[PDB]
Amino acid sequence: AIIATAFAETVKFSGSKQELQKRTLALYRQFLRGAPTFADLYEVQFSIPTIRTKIRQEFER
């Protein structure tokens, strides 16, 4: 078969806001945990706190 990539998630539309709440919080956790990787992979000229600030901004939007 055609298998999924590393960090793939099957598309599953929640039928509840309370489950999507947990899903969104997990995704926020994953972004925050991966920000150091985003600074190492992309030769970033600024802080890891700045990356997390940007993540929080885009999640507040």
Partner 1 sequence: MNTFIIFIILIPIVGFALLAVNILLAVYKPYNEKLGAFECGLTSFNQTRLAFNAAFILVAILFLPFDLEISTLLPYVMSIYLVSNYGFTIVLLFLLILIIGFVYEINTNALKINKHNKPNTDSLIYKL
Nearer to partner 1, 11 or 41 (CB): 41
The position carrying tokens 């309370």 is 18
Nearer to partner 1, 34 or 52 (CB): 34
**Distances in whole angstroms, Cα of residue 14 to Cα of each of 18, 45, 48, 53:** 9, 38, 32, 27
40 binds partner 1 (CB under 8 A): yes
41 binds partner 1 (CB under 8 A): yes
Tell the smallest beta-carbon distance from residue 13 to partner 1 (Å). 33
Instruction: Dig out the tokens for 39 from the structure.
Output: 């600074």
